[PDB]
Amino acid sequence: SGAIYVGNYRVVNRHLATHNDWANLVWEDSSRDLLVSSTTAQGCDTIARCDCQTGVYYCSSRRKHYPVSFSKPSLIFVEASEYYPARYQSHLMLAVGHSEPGDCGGILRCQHGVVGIVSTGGNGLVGFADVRDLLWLDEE
Numbered sequence: 001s002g003a004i005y006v007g008n009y010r011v012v013n014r015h016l017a018t019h020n021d022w023a024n025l026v027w028e029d030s031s032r033d034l035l036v037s038s039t040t041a042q043g044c045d046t047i048a049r050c051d052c053q054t055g056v057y058y059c060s061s062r063r064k065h066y067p068v069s070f071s072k073p074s075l076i077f078v079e080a081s082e083y084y085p086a087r088y089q090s091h092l093m094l095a096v097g098h099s100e101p102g103d104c105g106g107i108l109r110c111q112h113g114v115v116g117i118v119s120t121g122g123n124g125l126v127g128f129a130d131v132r133d134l135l136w137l138d139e140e
């Protein structure tokens with residue numbers, strides 16, 4: 001589990017979105033595994049605006065933050081998980097590291113702020129759904 005709280009937005013994995021998220025929907029995209037809902041309170045998470053390929057992510061299944069290299073956001077084939085069939089996922093970054101389904105929502109951060117959230121796992125890789133292209137998270 002986990003979310004990003006930026007301005008009056010809440011960013012979660014689409015597969016973990018609640019009823020309240022859907023009842024306050026701003027934007028969602030199944031191919032990216034992202035959903036954004038509106039918040040009453042202002043969040044303070046800074047979104048990275050950059051092309052960094054190094055950062056640190058939180059792994060809830062290890063109670064640890066790990067430094068990783070990661071690929072630029074791409075369209076990748078993802079093998080079946082507990083929560084999605086085998087399919088293509090877009091705007092996805094991969095690193096070598098540990099990820100189990102419960103790890104989804106863990107923050108990946110660089111020197112510029114929040115890069116994205118854990119979205120995929122298995123075969124010794126961790127996949128992160130990028131948010132750095134969502135420039136509207138910063139406004140309205």
Ligand SMILES: [Zn+2]
Nearest residue numbers: 050052110112
């Ligand atoms: Zn950065």
